[PDB]
Amino acid sequence: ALLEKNEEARIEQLYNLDDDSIALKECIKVQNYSLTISLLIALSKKLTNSQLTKLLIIDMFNNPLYLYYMRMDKAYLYDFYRQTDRFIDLAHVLLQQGKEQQSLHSFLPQIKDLYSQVQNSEVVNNTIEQLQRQEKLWIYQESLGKRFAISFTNMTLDQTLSKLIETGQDKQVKEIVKKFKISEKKLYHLKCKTLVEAKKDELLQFAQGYMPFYTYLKSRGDKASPYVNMI
Amino acid sequence: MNRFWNTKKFSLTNADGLCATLNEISQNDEVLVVQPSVLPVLNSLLTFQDLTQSTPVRKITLLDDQLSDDLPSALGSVPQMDLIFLIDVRTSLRLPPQLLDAAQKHNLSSLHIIYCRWKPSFQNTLEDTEQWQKDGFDLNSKKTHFPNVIESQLKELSNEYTLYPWDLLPFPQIDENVLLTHSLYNMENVNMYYPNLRSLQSATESILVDDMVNSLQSLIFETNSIITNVVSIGNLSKRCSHLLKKRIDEHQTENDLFIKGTLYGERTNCGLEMDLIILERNTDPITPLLTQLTYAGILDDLYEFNSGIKIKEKDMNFNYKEDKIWNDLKFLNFGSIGPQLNKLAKELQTQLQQRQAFLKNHTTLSSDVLKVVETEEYGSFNKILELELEILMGNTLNNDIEDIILELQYQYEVDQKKILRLICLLSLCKNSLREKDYEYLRTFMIDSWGIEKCFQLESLAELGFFTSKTSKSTRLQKEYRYISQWFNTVPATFAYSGVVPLTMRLVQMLYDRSILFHNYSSQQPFILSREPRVSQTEDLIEQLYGDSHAIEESIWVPGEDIALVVFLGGVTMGEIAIMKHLQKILGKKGINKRFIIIADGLINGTRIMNSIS
């Protein structure tokens, strides 16, 4: 049967002979990728419904073709990944699922555990250190966000810092600097960045930076007399 | 058409076939239902007035979940004759669920759908007249096929399966010279080359290469051409060339191999040459990210072209087959548009009103574009240009880069995409970045743009765009300051920051080793060769890619010009501008050729950034 030269008649005969374990190899050898998905659909519908995974572990190797076919179901993609023990795939799938309904911190502990107990690489070590930093940020956000009812949730450092600078808490807003090792250069002309965006001149008493803030005051808005001749 | 590629002649066949099918549906009042992704392509081919006059259809709609609520409003109303859906299943191998839910709920009594496919040239004009009843039923097609393809999943409701295979072959839209095939996006707006899920790359790549090979086979068999020389570049191009060769050598009919013996053959030839130089976008990720300076490039990265060549904000069409003002200004530099427009306006004063309307619209659009370039974060459009020009030649110092990256981060407001593209270019230009800067750059990125940015910087850190100093897919592992010595990219050039694209010189070297003669040359096999050849140019490309096997040269025949330079991975439209310059300069030098640029879909920097997200 396999000596045919029609690319469809021999595919039909091999499957019709009940030797449905070699036609897949021929199909992936010819690289049609259009009849193969049809063959998978036909073969899945007539069997115990549980030996598909058994066939796909040994045969077809990884070749995520059928996985790509089921990408918008989110149900069949779960149990197969769980059984195959592809924990990275499960973590990415649940990450994408959380990305949908504007909620990522809810799924964060799972990533903290899925990427945990991996013992396979060192970039994952950097990822889990970043996750530890995120957890420290979250616990500090909860600590500082509950003293005053200002409705602090999610957001990033700069988003929190920008509103924190207004009505700033001295010796507390700079307290996080030593905890997170914030760069000195970035924070210099940032308080003015967060102030003059609204209606006002604290930079005048900020003389304790460098060149750029001259242009920044020149950019936004008059009153060019401050700090004319510091150089 | 007939060995002379009349590109505009390709347009008529698709329209004629669609009109014939729609008029053969039923002689009544019809309502058309079109998939959202394929509708812009159809509107770019058939106008609404022509569609109404040629066939009795009087309504067009869209596949949406809104139709489910409108099933009792829109579907319940009208329905004079039937409902004819139109779907695209060439990729993603899955019918949209909208029709599945609408069939069972509204309970349609007549289901007819249209599915697109490439032209089956192997059907060879129905193969005469079935050989006088197959010489007594000696041949038959009943059950001599698999029960169904893809649509086998449709086995519910009724038996109303009046499928209709509308044919489709590539046709040019943006310009006469360049055709375009839409195989780089799915129905979910996911990139076909850079998907946002790092678990299924191999299958997606295989599907893309298969579809590209199918389209090339369709065009080749339609035009009746005989490829003689192939210059494959990269890894994927090797598989593409081998698959195309096998498929051509298998499915070809008779009565042409006899011609293949007469033409060409042994001990003789007839002086006909076609070339099939193939490239991959991953080979040169240096120049999909630079800032566009040509008119259509500037108009493109600020307002994204859809599947059809048009824009949402404006109303006038940019089609070249009815207007000539757009023909002479599309690819010119932005600076040389004003005075040219002034001269065009002043010359008509001494001297039909359609021309006046066209020039007025062009003047208004140019004024609006010029106004929006400035006053919108003033200086950024130029500052990015100076920074890119400084980086390309190489002036990075010790830790000074961290000062300038945040210099325009919040002094002038700017989008995330510009910063990400610029930092990717920074990390790619030097071919390596040390281990003492990621710890700060990644920290600042995750600090300023949320927590999900770590996933982006991790996923993007394996395709080669974001690599660290401490089945290869043909990455690039050579310093760019070296490439500025062998090649003369930085001195003739436009549409960029005065830099020649790397693909430009890669194709230049195949026919004339002049710039390669000035630097790194003591002897060459030739100076002006008509046929494409690669010899004594291995070591330079051995170190450039880490393997002396990316270059492939194939001769098929044993023994003025049409060159098919396909582009697997999108076309940065600035390359199209320099392709015409190449054609002109080569024709001036003595070698006369014609270039057709096959594209799988326009690609651009920002359009890439949403892809890997």
Side-chain angles (χ1 to χ4, degrees), chain B residues 40 104 128 167 231 347 369 394 500 528 549 555 571 585:
Chain B
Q104 52 90 30
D128 195 359
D167 272 24
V231 184
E347 70 91 14
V369 164
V500 164
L528 193 141
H549 298 80
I555 294 292
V571 290
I585 186 183

Short mmCIF file of all heavy atoms in Angstrom, two decimals, chain B residues 40 104 128 167 231 347 369 394 500 528 549 555 571 585:
data_model
loop_
_atom_site.label_atom_id
_atom_site.label_comp_id
_atom_site.label_asym_id
_atom_site.label_seq_id
_atom_site.Cartn_x
_atom_site.Cartn_y
_atom_site.Cartn_z
N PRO B 40 -11.77 43.26 4.09
CA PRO B 40 -10.97 44.34 3.48
C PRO B 40 -10.30 43.95 2.18
O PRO B 40 -10.13 44.80 1.30
CB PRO B 40 -9.93 44.66 4.57
CG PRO B 40 -10.59 44.26 5.83
CD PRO B 40 -11.36 43.03 5.49
N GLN B 104 -27.46 26.35 14.77
CA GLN B 104 -28.37 25.59 15.62
C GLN B 104 -29.43 26.49 16.25
O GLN B 104 -30.57 26.06 16.43
CB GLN B 104 -27.58 24.85 16.70
CG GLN B 104 -26.62 25.71 17.50
CD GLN B 104 -27.27 26.32 18.73
OE1 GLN B 104 -28.18 25.74 19.31
NE2 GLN B 104 -26.79 27.50 19.13
N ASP B 128 -8.93 17.78 -20.45
CA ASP B 128 -9.65 17.58 -21.71
C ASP B 128 -11.13 17.41 -21.38
O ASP B 128 -11.71 18.30 -20.72
CB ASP B 128 -9.01 16.42 -22.48
CG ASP B 128 -9.43 16.38 -23.93
OD1 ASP B 128 -10.23 17.24 -24.35
OD2 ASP B 128 -8.96 15.48 -24.66
N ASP B 167 -11.68 30.37 -6.17
CA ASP B 167 -10.24 30.37 -6.37
C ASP B 167 -9.65 31.73 -6.03
O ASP B 167 -10.33 32.75 -6.00
CB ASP B 167 -9.92 29.98 -7.82
CG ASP B 167 -9.80 28.48 -8.00
OD1 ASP B 167 -10.38 27.73 -7.20
OD2 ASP B 167 -9.12 28.05 -8.96
N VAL B 231 19.38 30.63 -5.32
CA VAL B 231 20.36 31.09 -4.34
C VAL B 231 19.63 31.18 -3.00
O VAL B 231 18.98 32.19 -2.69
CB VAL B 231 20.99 32.44 -4.72
CG1 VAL B 231 22.07 32.82 -3.71
CG2 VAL B 231 21.56 32.39 -6.12
N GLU B 347 1.97 75.08 -11.73
CA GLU B 347 1.93 74.83 -13.17
C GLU B 347 0.51 74.66 -13.68
O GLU B 347 0.23 74.98 -14.85
CB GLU B 347 2.78 73.60 -13.52
CG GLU B 347 2.21 72.26 -13.06
CD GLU B 347 1.32 71.61 -14.11
OE1 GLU B 347 1.36 72.06 -15.28
OE2 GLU B 347 0.58 70.67 -13.77
N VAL B 369 0.30 66.18 8.13
CA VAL B 369 1.42 65.33 8.54
C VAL B 369 2.58 66.19 9.02
O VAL B 369 3.20 65.89 10.05
CB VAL B 369 1.83 64.40 7.38
CG1 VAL B 369 3.21 63.81 7.65
CG2 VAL B 369 0.81 63.29 7.20
N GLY B 394 28.89 53.60 16.13
CA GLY B 394 29.51 53.10 17.35
C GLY B 394 30.22 54.15 18.17
O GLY B 394 31.36 54.51 17.87
N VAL B 500 22.61 52.13 4.31
CA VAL B 500 22.20 51.12 3.33
C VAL B 500 21.82 49.84 4.08
O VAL B 500 22.58 49.39 4.95
CB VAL B 500 23.31 50.86 2.32
CG1 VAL B 500 23.07 49.56 1.56
CG2 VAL B 500 23.43 52.03 1.36
N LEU B 528 31.93 40.98 -13.46
CA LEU B 528 30.57 41.19 -13.95
C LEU B 528 30.07 39.86 -14.51
O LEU B 528 30.41 39.49 -15.64
CB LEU B 528 30.53 42.29 -15.01
CG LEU B 528 29.16 42.83 -15.40
CD1 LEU B 528 29.22 44.33 -15.61
CD2 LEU B 528 28.64 42.14 -16.65
N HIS B 549 27.40 26.75 5.82
CA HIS B 549 26.35 26.01 5.14
C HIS B 549 25.07 26.80 4.95
O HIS B 549 24.10 26.26 4.41
CB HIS B 549 26.03 24.70 5.89
CG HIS B 549 27.19 23.75 5.97
ND1 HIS B 549 28.21 23.90 6.88
CD2 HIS B 549 27.48 22.64 5.25
CE1 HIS B 549 29.08 22.92 6.73
NE2 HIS B 549 28.66 22.14 5.74
N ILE B 555 21.49 24.43 -9.09
CA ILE B 555 21.26 24.47 -10.53
C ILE B 555 20.29 23.35 -10.87
O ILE B 555 20.54 22.19 -10.54
CB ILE B 555 22.58 24.33 -11.32
CG1 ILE B 555 23.48 25.54 -11.08
CG2 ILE B 555 22.29 24.16 -12.80
CD1 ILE B 555 22.95 26.82 -11.66
N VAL B 571 8.23 42.37 4.63
CA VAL B 571 9.05 43.33 3.89
C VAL B 571 9.00 44.66 4.64
O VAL B 571 7.92 45.24 4.82
CB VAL B 571 8.61 43.49 2.43
CG1 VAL B 571 8.93 42.24 1.65
CG2 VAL B 571 7.12 43.78 2.34
N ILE B 585 20.41 51.23 -11.11
CA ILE B 585 21.87 51.30 -11.19
C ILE B 585 22.42 50.09 -11.92
O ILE B 585 23.39 50.20 -12.69
CB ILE B 585 22.49 51.47 -9.79
CG1 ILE B 585 24.00 51.70 -9.90
CG2 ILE B 585 22.22 50.26 -8.91
CD1 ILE B 585 24.71 51.80 -8.57
#
